[PDB]
Amino acid sequence: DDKAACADGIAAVKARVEKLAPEAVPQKLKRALKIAEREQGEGEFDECLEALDDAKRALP
């Protein structure tokens, strides 16, 4: 479900980001990941999924 997709998507995005130079991770990507994790912690897994799309559009 959305809860499962949210957790998997956070891991997926972080997997991609972990292959970037840390000094080249854009701030907007970090902000989007933290929004996704905030919404995940609030139980709003649908909003987590929407923040992950922002995060994916922030990847170089």
Next chain:
Amino acid sequence: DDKAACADGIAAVKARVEKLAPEAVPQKLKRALKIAEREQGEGEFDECLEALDDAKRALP
């Protein structure tokens, strides 16, 4: 708009609650108000409006 409705609704609910004995304010009403204020602070005014409905359904 929703931002305006959210702020007005928080004030309205608190106005009703301020006319209750503090020891008789139900915990679920407090929790709903704090969720509404959290979502307001996050800029999710539509979700604030939905938490206010929960708050209103919690009034004695």
